[PDB]
Design a protein around this ligand. Structure first.
Ligand code: AS9
Ligand code: AS9
Ligand code: ZN
Ligand code: ZN
Lengths: 303, 302
């Protein structure tokens, strides 16, 4: 390949502050994210949401980088994030074109207890799978996990999907509208190793094949509800904070006030991720369920 | 002779535990009723609960003062000012003797505070006695008393209407989130508070008692840019360390470059509301308090 244009996005969601805080400082001083032989542009994707310290103004930005929206006629009637998405496509894409950026990192926080998390959009992309393995390995003994969101119908159109090689970086648990120092330090390490990986690769380092554990989306699940549609039971204490860890069909999952336990059910184990993410109450996702599988990558090298 | 008791929920609309309890209790109040004691549950800010946001126009829990409660009712007022009146009329009026006797106001914080109780008056013997019974009942689950009375720095709360205003605060919890363990703690806190009222209305005698409280002295902001932007954040040694002592040597903030900013001044303090999401706009990274003992006379009733 050889890797030319790399961006780092922060503030895709305005109330996930770690990225906004990093990105604002790197806009004032890029040293940390520069590598010799490699320019990297930091950028604030949703500045209006950042100012109102809110997830979004009109709709969720990280859901709408698709043809329906990016091809619409530009006007003032449109939702702000739609208007905004096109401006980003124009500056860092166009999506699906060779004139696009090569790599975009999109920075995020979650209220779920997920630790360092990388988000893989493509199960058979050797370059990204090698990146993630490098990062995992470099972070150790600190855990790092890979959420694979590829699905026939459930994959959503991300800010970073613009890029040839989209990457999502997600670090929790952190309350919305808060800057924790230990979370901050973790996003930074994550990024440090990713950029190290690119540099290495660009200087013609050869990577043997690798393999990684990832968690593949199967199904999102809502909180159980009323006939009024109000929440009837919450995340059971035993499932609280147990993102990534295996959940068997008899195991507790929800809890009513009364309080009776509602268990998992079905006839196979699953790995929950995004357990009790604040921003998903709105989307009716109390938890995602994943299967854990191992992916391989071929060798890769530059020129 | 403690007649009217209310439990308020959703003073802040994104602090979900209270909303969840109050909405359930409205449908079946058995948990909070006691033998010969009628306690009304109520949603203070229903519109902010609908949007799942702290407030709409301004913070409901600061404006139960004369400045706001004396305004002429009108569609042009900020929503929360209109609500503060409506509420005052139902459960007050504030400073009258027709006002409710006890109001419990339920809250959540992103700060690591555990079970906490907000004392608005350092003299009230009844509260001190209640707060002793709860703290003690809860043990060894820790429970703490934050005393916010102060010449200039006390703010006009939703519960300040009542003769006996009680704030109930549990954390750490993210806004927009219902955590089971937090839910459980909050309702053990109420269990014991209502139990104490019942014990008092059954004539049971309470001897003198002392408790430790944390008295406000001042609130500090995050250090800032030339542009008013945040330039340091809560140090990792201070993160989640509410209530624990912090000496002038000790570290308070951290910059992106790695620079540690120490406490300074001349005495130990006990910080409270360390890194509370909602106080970023109020420019209070933390509040500093001194540890203090308060004594209550014994009490009975008739
Ligand atoms: C909790 P979040 O909003 O950072 N999660 C992202 C997931 C992602 O980065 O794809 C989203 O929901 O758009
Ligand atoms: C973090 P919070 O909104 O529960 N704190 C209360 C403090 C209180 O209960 O007096 C407030 O800011 O009004
Ligand atoms: Zn996000
Ligand atoms: Zn509150």
């Amino acid at each position: 390949e050889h890797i030319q244009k790399v961006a780092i996005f922060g503030g895709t969601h305005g109330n996930e502050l770690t990225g906004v805080f990093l990105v604002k400082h790197w806009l004032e001083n890029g040293a940390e994210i520069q590598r010799t032989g490699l320019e990297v542009k930091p950028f604030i994707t949703n500045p209006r949401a950042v100012k109102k310290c809110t997830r979004y103004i009109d709709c969720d930005l990280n859901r709408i980088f698709d043809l329906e929206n990016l091809g619409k006629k530009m006007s003032e009637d449109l939702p702000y994030e739609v208007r905004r998405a096109q401006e980003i496509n124009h500056l860092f894409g166009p999506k699906d074109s060779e004139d696009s950026y090569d790599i975009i990192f999109d920075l995020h926080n979650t209220t779920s207890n997920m630790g360092c998390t990388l988000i893989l959009e493509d199960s058979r992309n050797n370059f990204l799978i090698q990146m993630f393995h490098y990062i995992k390995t470099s972070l150790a003994p600190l855990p790092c996990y890979v959420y694979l969101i590829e699905h026939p119908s459930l994959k959503y159109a991300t800010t970073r999907s613009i890029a040839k090689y989209p990457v999502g970086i997600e670090v929790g648990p952190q309350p919305q509208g808060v800057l924790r120092a230990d979370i901050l330090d973790q996003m930074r390490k994550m990024i440090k190793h990713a950029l190290d990986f690119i540099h290495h690769f660009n200087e013609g380092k050869e990577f043997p094949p690798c393999a990684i554990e990832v968690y593949k989306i199967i199904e999102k699940v809502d909180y159980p509800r009323d006939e009024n549609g109000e929440i009837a039971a919450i995340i059971h204490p035993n499932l609280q904070d147990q993102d990534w860890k295996p959940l068997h069909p008899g195991d507790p999952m929800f809890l009513t006030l009364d309080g009776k336990t509602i268990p998992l059910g079905g006839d196979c184990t699953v790995y929950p991720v995004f357990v009790n993410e604040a921003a998903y109450y709105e989307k009716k996702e109390a938890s995602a369920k994943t299967t854990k599988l191992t992916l391989n990558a071929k060798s890769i090298r530059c020129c």
